[PDB]
Design a protein around this ligand. Structure first.
Ligand SMILES: Nc1ncnc2c1ncn2[C@@H]1O[C@H](COP(=O)(O)O)[C@@H](O)[C@H]1O
Ligand SMILES: Nc1ncnc2c1ncn2[C@@H]1O[C@H](COP(=O)(O)O)[C@@H](O)[C@H]1O
Ligand SMILES: [Cl-]
Ligand SMILES: [Cl-]
Ligand SMILES: [Cl-]
Ligand SMILES: [Cl-]
Ligand SMILES: [Mg+2]
Ligand SMILES: [Mg+2]
Lengths: 346, 340
């Protein structure tokens, strides 16, 4: 009766240990009357490690030493299979069946649609946003353009590409955006610099081009840093808002008036729909002194530790952590059923 | 010589077209520079390693061309950067492939899923990356990004499962007028021309069979023109072609040819395409250019518009294939040089 949930975690990013913590907390809290779990760890070189819930961590209690436990099984996926899709690569024998994947692998590949694309090739249902929603939210330039087109507020900006970058001087950028500026790679908070003068500008742009082929240069926004948790597929719902306050403290709920809370929540939901998210996302905004709401980022893989903003916000809104995990799995399976019902030709 | 893995076939109704594309690429590819490895995907979605000497049944018959069945099924070990693909039956790795030329028409092969799998294998590949592929596949996302860029698209609304019943026919006619064209956002199957309410409800139901989003757009009056774009950061446009019959080059003024070409390049840049794309537009009587579609996996057969447009612009098919492979390798080399 139980579904087997494969939790895919870790990854090559600097957020590898956060992902381990997320996986640990999910394993600890998931409803065991409804779900069995299997742990699919990605080490820091990209390789996958399948383990049971009792032998996937090393030094699981101390955070400064927590680490993926190696697997003795190399796993492979057979693209195009509809069942028995995962096999022991060396023996060819199928692994125990996985009904749904819960991916919590931060950064490139894990959060940019590549992992979702591979899971789709293997016909594996999965939690969270699909290929397009993941890829688009990962690219801050594309996200900002879609949000702007929807009439939602974003920080005024210039996106530098390899093709266009030589057309701009610092004088052009300052003329359009003022000072200070924020410079960030479109796809990555690595490479983000605050810029007050020409020398810092050149160093920041050069730096960001070491991490991505596109660089977003933004007007600096004066505002509080508010975050909102969104949950759902076709009928998404927003949590209460939280705030990030320098000690940096996660403040739940944010100390804002209810009308402003609801205004941000409605904008979060609109943003979520504009970007085609599914399952979950965390929307990060700036709240200016005039209560203008400026959207900074839509994160399709929020942190999932017991202390992370996304679960804390749902807890503050009446949805406990165990129930949140169950809902995310139900949403994944609902979306998979809806997709598989679509027709392919006449 | 570089080892070029051609991934072809697949589950779509364009399976046979993909087979013909792969056959035409095998026959034309510069053998002084490339060794071909055939990775055929059968009609059920399983991947195989095929022998160039016998991979096609009825190869000279377009109505019966078929992929010869094979004992090997391929598997991928995610996250590996070498020996990424194995013979699933034997556990043994395939020899390293330097670059993938994917020509799998249909959903997974064009919507970014296949590209995501190849990225997870760190394989260079021809054509657009995950986001460009996924965004160009979704006509709603494409049209919104083009509109945001200041380029012209047909005025439209996008129906979803959630909002589907919020829009009455009267609301739609008031906003967009008649006739309308109704299409699934992601698929030209499911496309209907609508001249009244009875046709509208039938067309919307049809499009919702194929996708969760349905584009309803204003009918455009104009000639149907196509333009082939090639390149990464410095893309170039072929001469234009017209669909009436296929007329290559299109019988339009050179100034208008160049206007459409420059818009096709802008559209390509707006959507973040790489390698190649075919841009389909409407040319109105006032010479306004309304962009209909950006196709990131054009046809590669000998009757296909995309190679024919380049052929009529002085780029031969063999050199086109070589350039596409060079572009894939250039993009991989750029990505590989990034800090991580
Ligand atoms: N346009 C901006 N205006 C003001 N602060 C910004 C802006 N972009 C980034 N920041 C700051 O830089 C941090 C990291 O950038 P990000 O990863 O985009 O959140 C944020 O938490 C802000 O403190
Ligand atoms: N908005 C439109 N205005 C006029 N004709 C259209 C429009 N959308 C689609 N069509 C017609 O329908 C065909 C198939 O649509 P598509 O697959 O979008 O090209 C086109 O080749 C046109 O003949
Ligand atoms: Cl929902
Ligand atoms: Cl979070
Ligand atoms: Cl180029
Ligand atoms: Cl074509
Ligand atoms: Mg932030
Ligand atoms: Mg068309």
């Amino acid at each position: 009766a139980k579904m087997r949930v494969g939790i895919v975690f870790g990854g090559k990013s600097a957020e590898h240990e956060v992902s381990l913590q997320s996986a640990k907390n999910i394993v600890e809290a998931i409803d065991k009357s409804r779900f069995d779990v299997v742990l699919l760890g990605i080490d820091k070189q990209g390789l996958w490690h399948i383990n049971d819930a009792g032998n996937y961590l090393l030094n699981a209690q101390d955070p400064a030493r927590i680490a993926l436990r190696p697997s003795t099984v190399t796993l492979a996926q057979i693209p195009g299979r509809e069942a028995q899709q995962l096999i022991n690569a060396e023996s060819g024998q199928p692994l125990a069946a996985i009904d749904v994947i819960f991916p919590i692998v931060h950064g490139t590949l894990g959060e940019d649609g590549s992992l979702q694309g591979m899971l789709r090739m293997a016909n594996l249902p999965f939690v969270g946003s699909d290929v397009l929603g993941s890829a688009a939210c990962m690219d801050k330039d594309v996200t900002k353009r879609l949000l702007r087109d929807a009439g939602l507020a974003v920080a005024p900006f210039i996106t530098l590409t390899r093709a266009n970058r030589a057309q701009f001087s610092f004088a052009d950028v300052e003329a359009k955006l003022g000072l200070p500026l924020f410079v960030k790679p479109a796809n990555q908070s690595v490479g983000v610099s605050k810029v007050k003068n020409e020398e810092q500008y050149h160093q920041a742009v050069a730096l960001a081009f070491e991490f991505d082929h596109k660089v977003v240069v933004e007007q600096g926004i004066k505002g509080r840093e508010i975050e909102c948790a969104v949950l759902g597929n076709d009928h998404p719902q927003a949590s209460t808002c939280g705030e990030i306050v320098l000690n940096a403290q996660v403040v739940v709920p944010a100390a804002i008036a209810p009308e402003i809370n609801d205004k941000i929540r409605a904008i979060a939901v609109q943003a979520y729909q504009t970007l085609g998210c599914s399952g979950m996302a965390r929307v990060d905004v700036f709240l200016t002194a005039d209560n203008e709401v400026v959207i900074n980022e839509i994160n399709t893989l929020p942190g999932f530790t017991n202390i992370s903003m996304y679960p804390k916000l749902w807890q503050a809104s009446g949805l406990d952590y165990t129930s949140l995990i169950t809902r995310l799995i139900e949403l994944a399976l609902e979306r998979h059923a809806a997709d598989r019902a679509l027709k392919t030709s006449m």
